[PDB]
Amino acid sequence: IDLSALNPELVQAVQHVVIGPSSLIVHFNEVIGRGHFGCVYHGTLLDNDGKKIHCAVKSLNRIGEVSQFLTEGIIMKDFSHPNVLSLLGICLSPLVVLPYMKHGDLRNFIRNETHNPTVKDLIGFGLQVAKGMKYLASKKFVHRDLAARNCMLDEKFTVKVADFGLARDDKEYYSAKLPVKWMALESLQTQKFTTKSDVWSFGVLLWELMTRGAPPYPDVNTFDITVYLLQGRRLLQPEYCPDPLYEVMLKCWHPKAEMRPSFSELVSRISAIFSTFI
Ligand SMILES: COc1cc2c(Oc3ccc(NC(=O)C4(C(=O)Nc5ccc(F)cc5)CC4)cc3F)ccnc2cc1OCCCN1CCOCC1
Incomplete structure (x- = not known):
């Protein structure tokens, strides 16, 4: 150089x-x-x-x-x-x-058939992510690509919010290169991003956690996701996802950015949900 x-x-x-x-x-x-x-x-x-x-x-x-x-x-x-x-x-x-990061990325970790993270463990990873985002949001940093594929997991099963950036391998999820299926409605319509749009991404990340790394909206093509959301459609409740956690996801996907919860609220509510599990 x-x-x-x-x-x-x-x-x-x-x-x-x-x-x-x-x-x-x-x-x-x-x-x-x-x-x-x-x-x-x-x-x-x-x-x-x-x-x-x-x-x-x-x-x-x-x-x-x-x-x-x-x-x-x-x-x-x-x-x-x-x-x-x-x-x-x-x-x-x-x-x-x-x-x-011994365990690599969170998406690959939770898809691994030889380990059984419990519903509690998965909610736990979601909580760790909420805590990393609460911090980033406190610094007024906007992530713009929050997704399980961008979270890492260390030898102590600590989740680290990150972004592969130029080292992205997994690239089908981008279509500016845009992770459209993790994107908030108003980012899709304006290509603009905020902390409240990271909250939308976060709700999709939680859905990834609860499905153990299922691809979101698998029967929807990259570009069509906008009109799908505007029709009043959302990701279905995963089979083992507790009702209050699904209610959390739905609040993250409210069409009005300002009505989405903060990362501080997410941390407190998901801590309560997580504590209810044996
Ligand atoms: C693909 O596998 C791996 C990737 C790793 C890794 O990759 C990166 C992650 C993030 C950044 N970040 C970045 O380059 C940047 C970023 O992170 N910025 C950023 C943005 C937002 C934020 F909030 C925080 C940070 C762009 C600068 C850079 C990296 F190189 C870093 C550390 N350990 C890793 C271990 C891995 O596997 C171990 C093998 C695990 N196995 C699993 C079981 O099967 C056997 C294999």
Whole structure:
């Protein structure tokens, strides 16, 4: 890369979170995942006393695409919440270094046939997500792509709200590239986004949790979802979804953004629902 050909604002930021190349071992045959524009590798981060930290290392495959890449990392830099993915740092492709998430993404986790998360566990993951979003919303950050495929799960089954960004593999869900079936009605009609539109996404995420990762509206084509919603139609109540959790989802999908619950309300109500389970 030619550092000169990027905004000095992005440049000094990336220097506050820099990781010297000699502190980071990237294992290049050890590919976690590779999409069209980016890839992710296993990595080892050494600290100044020699202790090894297993990490994921995100990379570009390939000025514009480099400036976007670096910006995606920099956005994350000050998120510090246990339900939001954090940045370990950036190494000058430039390398964005993330903590390793043993269980990968939440959608793949809940679809895995060899494990049985209970209805309680699934509601539990939804609650963790609500807590990460309450934090993001407190910082006035709008996610715009909240979905189970963008939430990670660590060795302690802690959910980390994240966004694969350029490293998206799973791309059929986008059609601007737009995750239309997680989108609020007014984002679909205006291509504009808010915290209340993340709330709409959140309700769809909860439906993913309760169906163990079923695809939403599978008999609806990308572009047709707008008129479907305007006809007064919504996602059906999953078989094991408690009535009050389905009522939560419906409130998330209210046509008036301002009538959707806040993430603070979601946290309190879903905590109550979750506590009712043996
Ligand atoms: C595909 O599998 C994996 C991907 C991983 C990973 O990927 C990323 C996730 C997010 C970002 N974020 C980003 O690049 C950014 C982002 O996150 N920003 C952001 C946005 C909003 C927000 F609220 C917080 C952060 C774009 C910068 C970057 C990544 F590289 C990071 C850490 N560990 C991972 C482990 C994985 O599998 C382990 C194998 C698990 N198995 C399961 C069972 O079968 C065996 C395999």
